[PDB]
């Protein structure tokens, strides 16, 4: 819901014209199991939801925003660097599961189409290639173990390489 | 199927009677094949091979010399295969 | 040597016999295939599969 892209709408409609025989065995069993053990399961689920009555909403999600940039305060200080490194470690854990959503966007395309695979979609294929390539350069990958003090060096190495290429061209 | 003490003696006697080379009237069961019944040195091993094929196929080479009499051979085959309770 | 047919044996092999004969009718027709290979060579390719079993 909301975040997931998915397909617009599935068609799925049967005509059933060729061969009478016994109408349809797949449709007759589907209608039978809908009343046998599906409607009974729906009745028990509604009875438990109604029995709740009082429900607590609660805070759920915590805020925690900005708290100064890590690549501004330096020169080794315990009072300053500790909270700055906490922000970087929060974002790194968030970025891990951002990739997972984009990963599952490609999973949804493979399940729905199957036969088409690479001929259609294209948008989810392009979205995966753009984020992961940027993720490789900025967050870990070649920067070994997760550390915010070493993360500034990885950004500086990319900045020095880009400046060297721009000067030549 | 289980084997009986009277059944094992009857089964060994039936194979010994159809030997052709040995006389059915001369030897019954109690008589020894080594001295009393007409049997050669090579014939004694050949008679043991035919008896093993009919019953449970188990015959040691070292214990072949100890068994010569048909009464003793019937008892040795029943003891090794565990027969009659 | 005692050899006899048991009621457990009858209600097992007979149930396998239907599966070992009607497998070529149910499985092949139901599953949708892709690209048919049989077209060329009436004796060199098509008959060669059956002729090898005969020879």
């Amino acid at each position: 819901x909301x975040x997931x892209x998915x397909x617009x709408x599935x068609x799925x409609x049967x005509x059933x014209x060729x061969x009478x025989x016994x109408x349809x065995x797949x449709x007759x069993x589907x209608x039978x199991x809908x009343x046998x053990x599906x409607x009974x399961x729906x009745x028990x689920x509604x009875x438990x939801x109604x029995x709740x009555x009082x429900x607590x909403x609660x805070x759920x999600x915590x805020x925690x925003x900005x708290x100064x940039x890590x690549x501004x305060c330096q020169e080794k200080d315990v009072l300053c660097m500790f909270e700055a490194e906490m922000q970087w470690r929060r974002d790194y854990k968030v970025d891990q599961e951002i990739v997972n959503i984009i990963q599952e966007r490609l999973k949804a395309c493979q399940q729905r189409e199957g036969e088409s695979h690479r001929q259609n979609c294209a948008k989810e294929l392009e979205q995966f290639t753009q984020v992961v390539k940027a993720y490789q350069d900025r967050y870990x990958x070649x920067x070994x173990x997760x550390x915010x003090x070493x993360x500034x060096x990885x950004x500086x190495x990319x900045x020095x390489x880009x400046x060297x290429x721009x000067x030549x061209x | 199927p289980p084997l009986t003490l009277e059944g094992i003696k009857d089964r060994v006697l039936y194979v010994l009677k159809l030997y052709d080379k040995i006389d059915p009237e001369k030897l019954s069961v109690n008589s020894h094949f080594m001295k009393d019944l007409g049997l050669d040195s090579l014939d004694q091993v050949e008679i043991i091979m035919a008896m093993e094929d009919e019953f449970g196929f188990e015959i040691p080479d070292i214990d072949a010399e100890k068994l010569m009499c048909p009464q003793e051979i019937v008892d040795y085959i029943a003891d090794k295969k565990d027969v009659y309770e | 040597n005692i050899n006899e047919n048991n009621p457990l044996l009858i209600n097992s092999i007979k149930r396998l016999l239907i599966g070992s004969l009607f497998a070529g009718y149910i499985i092949s027709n139901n599953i949708p295939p892709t690209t048919i290979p049989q077209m060329t060579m009436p004796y060199y390719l098509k008959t060669t599969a059956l002729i090898v079993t005969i020879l």
């Binding site: 049967x14 349809x24 065995x25 797949x26 069993x29 589907x30 199991x33 809908x34 599906x38 | - | 139901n30 599953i31």
Partner: protein, 55 residues
């Protein structure tokens, strides 16, 4: 909707004797018969989603 529901049933039916393996309910001599009856209805519950797949 039932395709996803009935697919788990075939997996859950085979794990039910494992649930009864750890004592649960006593079954003398009928324990080999219980496995036979478990797979029998597991076959019927697997035949229905394949019929849906042909469609």
């Amino acid at each position: 909707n039932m395709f996803s529901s009935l697919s788990l049933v075939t997996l859950l039916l085979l794990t039910m004797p494992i649930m009864m393996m750890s004592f649960n309910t006593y079954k003398p001599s009928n324990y080999p018969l219980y496995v036979k009856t478990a797979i029998s209805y597991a076959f019927i519950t697997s035949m229905i989603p394949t019929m849906m797949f042909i469609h």
